[PDB]
Symmetry: D2
Subunit: 416 residues, 4 copies
């Protein structure tokens, strides 16, 4: 089956346009279900996970049309409030329809996400929020059912500033009676994009991007046009590629505000970075300085760039430490980096990376979306040729990574 073949490449040089954020668009597509009427989402990346959640909206009865980076949804006449096992198994962000459906129909039944490549990932905080709003929860043969006679706003506290739980609870609260306060909310940029979209539909959401979000429920929402924010993780991926290849890359169609920790850590590693209004230029250092990273809730260093920064550290001039506080098992890529000649040792949530002279091409498997992209970065600097398998992991969340890297001068090819 399919492989990505990467060869030792030239320093990457030129411009790359960044697509719309996967992780903004998935909850915003779920949010269209809140509205009686038609929404228009612009800047939608052409990704498999977008098509899967589109098919979930079709399954519950919304009218969905995608073309040329615009997705329309008419949720006027939703029929059903069940998310079947196969769709949640394919893509766990499916779970984000639970909030909207519960809010629109007072009842929903959603397959409970199972194992994940990057860890045991419970959805307890989502359900905590729904119960605080007056939903009763029960489990039936792998499904979780939530039903109420009406949602009522309430104060609720998130034990962890969960991105997903913040999204699900915000959407449910938008149509509740009264005022909801989400304490210890996720501050991620995608949370702000979602809130903006809810407000464009007629909601009253304040505080998004802060530690506390206040939602005053409205009786009804209407379809609206929204421009999705740019993919900050894709941007970061190309910024790291510039660092690792000692290249010079302008990343176009980005928001600097959303890239703060990545910019800071790349500068600490030796990069020369120029921040502009809609773009950032990254020039890689001649010698990579070892740095440490610790993944944390935004605006701490993002776990979605952890594997990619680890890959950069494998040829840094010294010892770097990576600490993963957000996910349990997000080190499955380490053994693959080691096949390419890295010197990485893990214990618990920390990985000690001892920089080597260079990596050497080898047959490797992507273990997950961000680690696969990290193996592509390894393959750009590794001597010889790298063959990456299980490439569906990559293809589900990066638009045309082969074409974008090809246009920056790298040697990469998807073969079937």
């Amino acid at each position: 089956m399919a492989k990505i073949i990467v060869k030792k490449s030239n320093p990457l040089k030129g411009s790359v346009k960044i697509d719309g954020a996967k992780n903004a668009v998935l909850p915003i597509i779920a949010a269209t279900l809140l509205a009686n009427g038609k929404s228009t989402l612009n800047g939608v990346p052409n990704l498999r996970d977008v098509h899967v959640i589109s098919d979930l909206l079709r399954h519950v009865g919304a009218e969905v049309e995608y073309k040329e980076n615009t997705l329309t949804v008419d949720a006027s006449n939703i029929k059903t409030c069940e998310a079947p096992y196969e769709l949640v198994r394919k893509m766990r962000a499916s779970f984000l329809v639970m909030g909207p459906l519960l809010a629109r129909f007072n009842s929903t039944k959603i397959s409970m996400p199972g194992g994940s490549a990057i860890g045991t990932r419970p959805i307890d905080l989502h359900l905590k929020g729904f119960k605080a709003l007056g939903a009763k929860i029960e489990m039936d043969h792998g499904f979780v059912e939530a039903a109420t006679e009406k949602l009522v706003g309430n104060k609720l506290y998130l034990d962890f500033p969960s991105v997903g739980a913040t999204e699900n609870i915000m959407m449910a609260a938008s149509l509740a009676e009264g005022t909801t306060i989400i304490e210890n909310a996720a501050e991620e940029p995608e949370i702000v994009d979602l809130a903006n979209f809810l407000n464009e539909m007629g909601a009253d959401v304040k505080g998004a991007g802060t530690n506390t979000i206040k939602i005053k429920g409205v009786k009804e929402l209407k379809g609206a046009e929204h421009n999705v924010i740019p993919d900050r993780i894709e941007a970061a991926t190309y910024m790291v590629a510039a660092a690792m290849t000692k290249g010079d890359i302008t990343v176009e169609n980005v928001l600097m505000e959303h890239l703060k920790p990545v910019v800071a850590k790349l500068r600490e590693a030796g990069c020369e970075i120029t921040e502009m209004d809609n773009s950032v230029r990254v020039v890689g250092p001649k010698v990579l300085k070892p740095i440490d990273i610790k993944t944390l809730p935004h605006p701490g260093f993002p776990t979605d760039v952890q594997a990619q920064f680890m890959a950069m550290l494998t040829v840094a001039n010294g010892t770097g430490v990576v600490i993963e506080t957000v996910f349990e098992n997000r080190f499955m890529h380490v053994a693959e980096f080691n096949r390419m000649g890295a010197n990485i040792k893990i214990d618990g949530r920390s990985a000690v990376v001892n920089g080597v002279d260079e990596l050497h091409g080898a047959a490797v498997n992507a273990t997950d979306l961000r680690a696969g992209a990290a193996l592509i970065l390894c393959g750009l600097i590794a001597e010889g040729e790298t063959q990456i398998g299980e490439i569906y992991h990559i293809q589900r969340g990066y638009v045309d990574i082969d074409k974008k890297i090809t246009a920056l001068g790298g040697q990469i090819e998807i073969v079937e």
Copy 2:
């Protein structure tokens, strides 16, 4: 040497006035050193750590006067910029004079804090910030020296949202040339109090209490009058005491905004809590419901109430899990709780508490400030009599815990 003797007590009932926040006043006292002139701090708790940092200010040449909860400082004619080993060894918040002194005199030499009861606690992020402002750092025989020809504002990123580093860097940046941005800042309420005080002295600090703080340096600051915020951890301590003793306590002179996670978790445990403008009433449940807590940066659950909530969980109706993400070794109290008949097992950063019928009085030692207070809470509900040793831990950060608990109907006595 001295002991606190606690006996099985009546349910606590009545009102308790909360003192000024230890952890607000210590950085605000350090901040008085920034000003050429005299500051007046009202609501200063009469605590040993206040007197230690006062003596540190005396050592560098400030004029300090304390009386009846007001502290005045005239920092007009500071002489010296060295913090000696004995003062930092006695109280590690001593380290918070480094920022002000560096800013006022362009040079400072500060003993580097050593071991701590609750963990290995580096000060690397403080120094990261100072270097970003143009300070050169070097180590000399246990001291860290930082010197510059002038501080210049800069963007800097905190790998962890460190309370202390946020404080130290904010104070240094207040007199720097140009604009400093602290990304991934601590959002703790004490950070806001400090910023307010800097602004009262003439500074330009915006964003405090958010994830990003922007400081535009000014050439000079002037002494100002400030009212310190109330001690949110002391308040929480009494709120827990109400829960554990099945009492009914009004905590006076508090800010509900600062107590959000404690209020939420006590309500989840079964308490009936009434939030008012300057006070909160806590009525304890008849049966404590087991809850889980996870310590996190504000507004996540505070590590300073972790031991005290653990103590509550030792008689809860089931199994609770405590996860300490902020400090490394903040479980030294567990063996002492176990001497009183708790059923607690730890591995790594998690403690599994299996609720028991009741605790039984025993001879125990406080291991640190918040754990000692937790042993007092255990002793209020434990059968018989509890004798607590190493009480200096407690006395350094609680005002008259014997008198306040005595006025709420508990049986407690300090003996010499």
Copy 3:
């Protein structure tokens, strides 16, 4: 693709014959490569991993014949000393030919194992041992090459009592010049079986099953007949099944010595166990008592029975804690147990299991060999019907689990 369908079942009752140990036979098959001549292995389980390593022996030029639980190997005329990427990727115990090949031909090149379902699993200790014997090591594009002018016995210390490293080093040392001492050796029963087989071929291996193994190299080894020990993990799997289903099962063709920790922990959980010469009877309790387990090197509790004991604990009468010290990510099954209604929370290497009334059938995926078998145990007691996917994990290491459970009265079927 294929599924195992398990339904709520009767208590299991009757006898089950245990097959030969997967984990004894794989290193013993690698060890046949040491001998110039023909070996005969009896009690070989008819498992996919046996056929994969057989094909690896074919690839290097040994003559291999399997029939009716006997495998013969003639290693007289080995041709090549390379283990290709596809065979090691399929089955990482492939790596165990490195020791024999290095010893027979003074040179070997072996693909370095990559990611594993249950953790990042380096092979550094294997290479440490080979270097101590005089091998030079280098990496070439995912392969590790080891070559010497002659192996010479030496003292070497294992940082961890690695099963695989102990096996690989013992086999290499059997043909070395002089005496090797392996300090901090694995004491697992499979290590003793291997040593016995080496001695049957003419080796001089003493201390196997103790913390120190002394090998005096011989110039040549000869094929021998060996009876492989019974599969202690398969036995344990059926013993757990008896406990969980409240059944009464005699496990036939086992060695009690190898089952000590499993027998002790099942008795602590409430089982009535009768140890006999070649068999053990397990009668399950009416109420399962919660127990804690901590995985450790033999004779500590085996990590290969961890998932299966976790599954038992999901319906125990209280709270049990599972601590995995041997493998990093061996909790991927937890999310699947949770889909079936378990109440499991993990942090770091510990899992807190809060016993529930009963499990409920659901669609689940095996994540690995021992966890898949654990999902079958869940499905026997879960209400309704459980559908298990990714069943190749199970089928690679259990002989006819459907037929054996069917003969004990359970309802299970493999469908294609």
Copy 4:
């Protein structure tokens, strides 16, 4: 109060005689209580912990005489079976009288050890063993009481190969009716010494030093003469000192068998070591090679030499990783090493040591016995002068460390 002053020293050269093992003698002194009659222990180190447990034996009514490294005990006419809070608080090995007293009198009451400098250290496995022998356990106000109508031999499984629990259970089982089997026993050399002493008194203990110990109870034991084994941790401490100071030291009166992992790791670090019958010569390398250590049950690397090897690694030529699997909080020394200019970062149970050019003298505090000795090793190589406080930690478990290091050419002094 008292300090140890160490100055940058010459390479250590000469011979040092090692004393009797603290950790052998403490359980062997407890074991004298088993015998009706008089025991004579030779090679008893003149240590405070020896005098504390001697006073515990006096408290229960044994006749104890110490002189010139011989301790006699007549346990003929024991009166009482209670270990008071003050003696256990002073020295937690006090707990090891519980087994003997329970066995001699069928009843005992022992204060339950509280907090410890190096971790939360439960005694649950001790009690598990006693209950398996027919003892009923209950807690009374910090004491644990264990009583039976008679101890009866039984099989019991240790979840962890606890040194203390193995000792306590072995001593209790020596006078039980029938045969006890301890599965997953501690294999530490001190366990063998104890068993030898029990057998010298008339017991029947086999398997000590293996993973399984079988005790056939006898009705009565008689006082015997015993020669205690040498202190393997003291020996290791001086061996490390040779490595760190680039010296050349013969350690006299040792058993090489007990030092295997320390010898292996020092050789991996670059030392030239010569093993002899009663002694070992260690010559330190010119450049220390970084190594990793992982603490484990014997014969894995001992946790009691972890701090001392960490100290060696602070000036090694590269990055070493220390992993502590045995104790929870055994990193309290790290902040003190950092005051002396080390570069150590911890997360969870792992410490990353990044070797520096040299350490620099500073005021430091011992946190515990083995860490204090490690600070002395730091002070021998640190530039200038090191002042170590809280020296009682050191003095309780090292005989005349000042005099022994002075005789090897180091500059050290205890001042009062």
